[PDB]
Amino acid sequence: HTLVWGVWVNGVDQGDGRNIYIRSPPNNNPVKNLTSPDMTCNVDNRVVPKSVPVNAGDTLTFEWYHNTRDDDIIASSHHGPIAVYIAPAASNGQGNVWVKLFEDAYNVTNSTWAVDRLITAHGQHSVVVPHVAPGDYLFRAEIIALHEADSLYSQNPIRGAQFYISCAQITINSSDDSTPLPAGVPFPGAYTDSTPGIQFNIYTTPATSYVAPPPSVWSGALGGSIAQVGDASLE
Template sequence: MRLSYVFTGLAAAAASVSAHSTVWGVWINGVDQGDGQNQYIRSPPSNYPVKDLNSNAVACNVNNRAVPKTLKVKPGDTVTFEWFHDYRDDEIIAASHKGPVVVYIAPTSSNGAGNVWVKLYQEGYNGNWAVDKIIATHGQHSIKIPNIASGQYLLRPELISAFELANVAYSSNSARGVQLYMSCIQIEVQGSGSTLPSGVAFPGTYKYSDPGLVFNLYESSPSSYVIPGPAIWSGSAGGSISRAGTPGQAPPSGGSGGSGTVDKYQQCGGIGWSGATACVSGSTCTKVNGTFIQSTKAIMNQQRDRFADYYYQCQ
């Protein structure tokens, strides 16, 4: 195989990955909770989309399983989700991936299965696509925690990419189809409100016949777009697309081991990091997750050094 073909393949793979997105972090009332990948976010193994609407991955993406941490919140708190390609403070998602943003909630005890998902927020096209607005706010959008009963819940933010491949259903052509990006965040609500009502099921709610899931972006009026799924729950406290801050500006509350030390598996350095860098006894601040990005970006001559030290974690 000619070397140029290898480089072309790697560059194409990098470009494809760069088009996609996943949730990397959460803010609570403007306070950065740190990198949440596989910590309080049930992170998928990659930023690739879910396209099969009948797959169990529609609930919490691939690799849905409990993770070590749960974020504590109260009714009225603002929870901000943060989307990026490959690491915190990276690009967000390709501008061609236009579409809406939605947020659901379900009891953690359900593990996302059954008629449990209640819609808290949605935004589609209102002069601009929601995804375009999220790109402008550096990958951030927010919801307010509604007045619900104490307990553990999963928050499910989702970007629905209705770009050029979405004019044909995945069931008709697996190379095409709408692209769904979602992650589930573990939270514990400390409140005394009402129990969540019955919700909808993933998979099951989204259909290949839904006009918001098979949409011709270039031949249809954006204002005609219909966001798929149920109506927003009447008990929702709302949400918005706005920016909470820059990753690393403030270490998460309770995230350090005391006296400027960082707990095991928490961030201790990298681009934009201004928090503590000393790890608790028995762990070392170690670079993680950089190999693929560094090599493919270097092939495309895109600031190789910038990607060498983007994220460190106590291990």
């Protein structure tokens, strides 16, 4: 159970974005139905009044929280991967539009899931803004909590992989467009009951064997991190 509070751009806090530049849902409950319209941008997908200005190459940091800013972030039980996708904003997230910019699942070197490291990072993970066409975009940050994912939601709706999905409205101003954004995958649609990484038993299957759901990270993606960029406590 987690939400995005706001974003940072090059280590500068853009301020509380909830219902302003984040298409915030009404609460921190997960989406679990893989065929739900709620898989696009969570349960209240609508245009919000602001879009955060960035340039290509900026570090864009998402900041998550549980109940209040800079708290425990997400229950430690919620082990799983983190991904970020981008789509042009005029799509409203509909159609074959989502391109993956970032994936982090289980780090064998550290012996930790992405969610475990997100807690240590005070809720913060970042991407480099890609060199796509200037214009308005949706950045879809997705945490998948796997503590109940041994079942399919379609078999037992009390269980299933849990999707914490947050869409930020981002405007890319300066970009040379050296990596034009291709068509991508649909949400809902990209994840199905048979997709690798959706049904996974963390109690019985080693995390060293986990394969995160496709699609693979786009060749145009410039990277990211799970690390505290900004100190919310200094404000």
